[PDB]
Amino acid sequence: AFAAKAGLMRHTIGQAEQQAMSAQAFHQGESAAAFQGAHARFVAAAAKVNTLLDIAQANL
Amino acid sequence: SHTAFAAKAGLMRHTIGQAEQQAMSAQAFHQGESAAAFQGAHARFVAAAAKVNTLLDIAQANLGEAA
Amino acid sequence: GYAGTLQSLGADIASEQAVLSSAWQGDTGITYQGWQTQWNQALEDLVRAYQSMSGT
Amino acid sequence: GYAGTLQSLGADIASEQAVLSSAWQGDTGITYQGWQTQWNQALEDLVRAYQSMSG
């Protein structure tokens, strides 16, 4: 039935839109969280590098 | 030797700070780029969807009982 | 997998409108062929915009 | 391109230390080998975190 296929298309457009919006929101949040974790790990590593540079200097 | 170590230690400390600032700026840019790209595509999708719904409305009206 | 579903549904509707071409009123505005042409461009625009939204 | 620069600088520091360090002091809490292991691990962690932050 044309009307059935037309109904299905209208429904599917709305679903596709909702899926894409949701995925973008998820991906923005996942990126933000991954950056914060990475940044924390970078800062911790840099602290160690600074401690180790001082040790090197003391042993020159 | 010692002034050589000092040179390298100083550059490493400087480079770590620069890398951090660069990476923070890169992330902010990437988040903005992703959002702008989505917004644009979403606006195109909405316009196309409205065209499709319009054309379906016309087809249903035209076909009437034949739909 | 909405891109494929939208594309295939759109092709189904194009086919059905063509199958019902004899029932198409030609004095209401947009013509039978006009509709086919506009439908196929809208569908392409729709599928491509959806892929743009989803696209890494 | 900071990843490669951090790695190269890090290697230069380690290799300088290896040639300069004629009498490692124990009161600094490690040996040369202990320092080298920790240095290379710190640099790895540092560079991997940077690459995650920026892409």
Side-chain angles (χ1 to χ4, degrees):
Chain A
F2 185 88
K5 296 182 270 221
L8 218 212
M9 176 63 85
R10 295 184 207 266
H11 173 73
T12 303
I13 286 170
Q15 288 311 295
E17 196 190 9
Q18 290 297 316
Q19 176 264 295
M21 290 179 63
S22 180
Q24 171 71 196
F26 172 67
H27 284 100
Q28 277 162 351
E30 287 303 89
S31 173
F35 179 77
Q36 286 176 2
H39 190 195
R41 288 192 301 276
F42 180 95
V43 168
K48 294 182 203 175
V49 164
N50 280 292
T51 298
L52 291 162
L53 280 174
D54 292 342
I55 293 167
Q57 189 184 156
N59 281 285
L60 294 183
Chain B
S1 157
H2 301 130
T3 80
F5 168 90
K8 293 172 181 88
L11 186 63
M12 174 62 83
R13 289 176 158 112
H14 168 78
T15 303
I16 290 171
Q18 286 311 297
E20 189 186 21
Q21 291 302 323
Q22 186 275 141
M24 294 171 74
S25 173
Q27 166 68 186
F29 170 79
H30 286 152
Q31 290 284 41
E33 176 184 59
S34 170
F38 182 87
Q39 189 285 321
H42 186 205
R44 292 186 302 267
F45 179 86
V46 171
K51 197 136 33 226
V52 166
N53 273 274
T54 300
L55 289 168
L56 284 178
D57 289 352
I58 289 166
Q60 293 204 255
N62 275 27
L63 296 168
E65 198 179 18
Chain C
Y2 285 104
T5 302
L6 293 169
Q7 183 158 290
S8 52
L9 252 175
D12 289 347
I13 286 159
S15 170
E16 195 58 35
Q17 187 265 2
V19 163
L20 298 167
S21 75
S22 70
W24 192 267
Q25 299 183 75
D27 67 328
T28 52
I30 188 172
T31 65
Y32 164 85
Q33 276 181 311
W35 195 94
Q36 274 281 323
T37 307
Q38 296 185 229
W39 175 259
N40 288 320
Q41 191 55 58
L43 177 68
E44 176 196 338
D45 289 350
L46 186 77
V47 170
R48 295 287 289 268
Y50 177 76
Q51 295 180 302
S52 289
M53 274 184 80
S54 319
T56 182
Chain D
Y2 289 115
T5 296
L6 290 168
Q7 286 181 193
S8 68
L9 255 179
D12 293 357
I13 290 166
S15 69
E16 168 166 78
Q17 202 65 22
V19 185
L20 299 203
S21 327
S22 69
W24 202 265
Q25 312 189 128
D27 71 43
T28 58
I30 35 194
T31 50
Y32 175 68
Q33 182 55 71
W35 179 91
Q36 200 202 70
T37 302
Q38 284 180 227
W39 178 256
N40 290 322
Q41 186 57 53
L43 273 44
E44 281 179 58
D45 293 351
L46 186 79
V47 172
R48 291 183 172 274
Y50 167 77
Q51 289 174 317
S52 293
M53 283 175 84
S54 51

XYZ file of all heavy atoms in Angstrom, chain A residues 17-56:
290
model
N 16.778 10.331 12.627
C 17.159 11.593 13.245
C 17.478 11.433 14.725
O 18.484 11.982 15.205
C 16.055 12.648 13.069
C 16.550 14.077 13.352
C 15.436 15.107 13.417
O 14.237 14.704 13.411
O 15.761 16.325 13.507
N 16.636 10.681 15.437
C 16.827 10.463 16.879
C 18.089 9.672 17.161
O 18.833 9.986 18.084
C 15.627 9.732 17.482
C 14.369 10.582 17.544
C 14.525 11.796 18.455
O 15.075 11.692 19.565
N 14.046 12.958 17.988
N 18.315 8.630 16.377
C 19.542 7.841 16.477
C 20.801 8.686 16.274
O 21.735 8.576 17.060
C 19.528 6.681 15.479
C 20.834 5.864 15.453
C 21.749 6.327 14.344
O 21.408 6.198 13.161
N 22.917 6.854 14.704
N 20.812 9.522 15.232
C 21.969 10.356 14.895
C 22.237 11.419 15.969
O 23.397 11.666 16.352
C 21.768 11.009 13.525
N 21.168 12.038 16.458
C 21.283 13.044 17.543
C 21.873 12.398 18.796
O 22.822 12.922 19.414
C 19.912 13.681 17.819
C 19.411 14.592 16.688
S 17.744 15.347 16.974
C 18.046 16.298 18.345
N 21.327 11.242 19.158
C 21.795 10.510 20.338
C 23.274 10.094 20.228
O 24.018 10.138 21.207
C 20.942 9.268 20.559
O 21.414 8.576 21.692
N 23.659 9.619 19.049
C 25.025 9.173 18.791
C 25.982 10.351 18.877
O 27.086 10.219 19.401
C 25.099 8.528 17.418
N 25.567 11.517 18.394
C 26.441 12.696 18.441
C 26.632 13.133 19.896
O 27.757 13.458 20.332
C 25.881 13.832 17.578
C 26.602 15.178 17.737
C 27.992 15.206 17.148
O 28.784 16.098 17.452
N 28.297 14.250 16.303
N 25.551 13.127 20.655
C 25.630 13.514 22.054
C 26.558 12.552 22.807
O 27.414 12.965 23.586
C 24.235 13.526 22.665
N 26.408 11.262 22.541
C 27.275 10.242 23.145
C 28.743 10.457 22.789
O 29.626 10.442 23.654
C 26.837 8.856 22.665
C 27.770 7.759 23.078
C 27.901 7.430 24.414
C 28.523 7.079 22.133
C 28.760 6.426 24.807
C 29.404 6.089 22.520
C 29.514 5.757 23.855
N 29.006 10.667 21.518
C 30.366 10.824 21.044
C 31.044 12.101 21.562
O 32.240 12.071 21.891
C 30.415 10.662 19.523
C 30.298 9.230 19.092
N 29.116 8.674 18.637
C 31.199 8.218 19.120
C 29.309 7.393 18.371
N 30.565 7.093 18.654
N 30.296 13.198 21.681
C 30.829 14.425 22.295
C 31.224 14.181 23.759
O 32.306 14.593 24.206
C 29.826 15.586 22.181
C 29.886 16.319 20.832
C 28.636 17.161 20.534
O 27.623 17.087 21.242
N 28.699 17.942 19.469
N 30.361 13.493 24.504
C 30.636 13.175 25.908
C 31.815 12.209 26.081
O 32.634 12.362 27.010
N 31.886 11.200 25.218
C 32.968 10.208 25.250
C 34.306 10.879 24.953
O 35.291 10.628 25.621
C 32.723 9.098 24.227
C 31.618 8.095 24.566
C 31.792 7.364 25.898
O 31.306 7.894 26.936
O 32.382 6.243 25.913
N 34.323 11.761 23.968
C 35.512 12.548 23.641
C 35.964 13.419 24.818
O 37.157 13.453 25.174
C 35.247 13.417 22.387
O 36.346 14.308 22.175
N 35.018 14.107 25.440
C 35.320 14.984 26.578
C 35.901 14.187 27.762
O 36.937 14.552 28.337
C 34.083 15.738 26.986
N 35.263 13.070 28.082
C 35.744 12.168 29.138
C 37.119 11.575 28.826
O 37.963 11.474 29.727
C 34.738 11.044 29.350
N 37.344 11.177 27.570
C 38.633 10.588 27.175
C 39.728 11.657 27.268
O 40.820 11.392 27.764
C 38.568 9.979 25.776
N 39.434 12.869 26.836
C 40.396 13.959 26.979
C 40.768 14.261 28.445
O 41.944 14.461 28.774
C 39.887 15.249 26.338
C 40.844 16.380 26.496
C 41.967 16.453 25.696
C 40.651 17.346 27.478
C 42.886 17.479 25.875
C 41.558 18.369 27.653
C 42.671 18.430 26.834
N 39.775 14.326 29.314
C 40.027 14.560 30.744
C 40.914 13.466 31.344
O 41.874 13.764 32.062
C 38.714 14.660 31.522
C 37.962 15.952 31.292
C 36.581 16.012 31.995
O 36.207 15.069 32.691
N 35.872 17.127 31.858
N 40.629 12.205 31.029
C 41.491 11.105 31.491
C 42.924 11.199 30.982
O 43.881 11.096 31.747
N 43.062 11.393 29.673
C 44.353 11.572 29.033
C 45.131 12.713 29.677
O 46.326 12.574 29.965
C 44.162 11.831 27.536
N 44.449 13.837 29.899
C 45.062 15.038 30.472
C 45.578 14.795 31.885
O 46.692 15.208 32.228
C 44.077 16.215 30.444
C 44.695 17.536 30.791
N 43.947 18.646 31.108
C 45.990 17.931 30.843
C 44.754 19.661 31.366
N 46.001 19.251 31.211
N 44.775 14.120 32.695
C 45.193 13.674 34.013
C 46.443 12.773 33.938
O 47.389 12.963 34.710
C 44.012 12.954 34.719
N 46.468 11.832 32.991
C 47.610 10.930 32.830
C 48.862 11.669 32.385
O 49.986 11.339 32.816
C 47.304 9.785 31.861
C 46.340 8.755 32.437
C 46.271 7.506 31.589
N 45.839 7.771 30.217
C 44.568 7.879 29.825
N 43.574 7.779 30.700
N 44.287 8.116 28.545
N 48.670 12.657 31.522
C 49.763 13.513 31.052
C 50.408 14.309 32.209
O 51.636 14.368 32.337
C 49.233 14.475 29.967
C 50.288 15.409 29.411
C 50.976 15.095 28.254
C 50.586 16.597 30.048
C 51.959 15.974 27.738
C 51.564 17.458 29.544
C 52.226 17.150 28.387
N 49.569 14.932 33.026
C 50.010 15.691 34.196
C 50.769 14.778 35.182
O 51.849 15.141 35.653
C 48.811 16.412 34.839
C 49.141 16.971 36.216
C 48.335 17.518 33.906
N 50.236 13.593 35.455
C 50.920 12.641 36.355
C 52.283 12.248 35.796
O 53.277 12.237 36.524
C 50.068 11.409 36.587
N 52.347 11.969 34.490
C 53.618 11.597 33.827
C 54.642 12.731 33.852
O 55.834 12.500 34.100
C 53.365 11.148 32.369
N 54.179 13.950 33.598
C 55.031 15.131 33.648
C 55.645 15.353 35.038
O 56.826 15.726 35.152
C 54.263 16.355 33.186
N 54.854 15.149 36.086
C 55.372 15.207 37.458
C 56.532 14.209 37.636
O 57.561 14.534 38.233
C 54.239 14.909 38.470
N 56.389 13.013 37.074
C 57.434 11.993 37.213
C 58.671 12.412 36.444
O 59.779 12.258 36.920
C 56.938 10.638 36.735
C 55.832 10.077 37.590
C 55.399 8.699 37.122
C 53.982 8.378 37.574
N 53.516 7.069 37.023
N 58.465 12.947 35.242
C 59.565 13.440 34.417
C 60.314 14.528 35.158
O 61.540 14.530 35.184
C 59.064 13.965 33.028
C 60.152 14.819 32.352
C 58.639 12.795 32.164
N 59.592 15.438 35.805
C 60.275 16.492 36.568
C 61.088 15.966 37.765
O 62.223 16.393 38.003
C 59.292 17.619 36.939
C 59.067 18.564 35.777
O 59.976 19.281 35.384
N 57.874 18.543 35.196
N 60.529 15.014 38.489
C 61.251 14.331 39.567
C 62.498 13.621 39.058
O 63.570 13.716 39.675
C 60.336 13.316 40.290
O 59.230 14.016 40.889
C 61.114 12.577 41.368
N 62.369 12.931 37.922
C 63.509 12.202 37.357
C 64.592 13.133 36.792
O 65.768 12.767 36.789
C 63.034 11.202 36.301
C 62.255 10.042 36.897
C 61.425 9.328 35.836
C 63.215 9.060 37.586
N 64.206 14.303 36.269
C 65.194 15.272 35.802
C 66.008 15.800 36.983
O 67.211 16.021 36.880
C 64.522 16.460 35.088
C 64.090 16.285 33.650
C 63.317 17.517 33.158
C 65.348 15.998 32.811
N 65.348 16.040 38.108
C 66.073 16.471 39.312
C 67.056 15.419 39.788
O 68.194 15.750 40.142
C 65.114 16.837 40.432
C 64.333 18.082 40.131
O 64.747 18.846 39.238
O 63.275 18.281 40.776
N 66.638 14.157 39.787
C 67.533 13.063 40.139
C 68.751 13.004 39.210
O 69.867 12.837 39.671
C 66.807 11.667 40.172
C 65.796 11.619 41.312
C 67.837 10.535 40.368
C 64.827 10.437 41.252
N 68.531 13.166 37.910
C 69.610 13.188 36.948
C 70.567 14.319 37.271
O 71.764 14.093 37.340
C 69.070 13.310 35.527
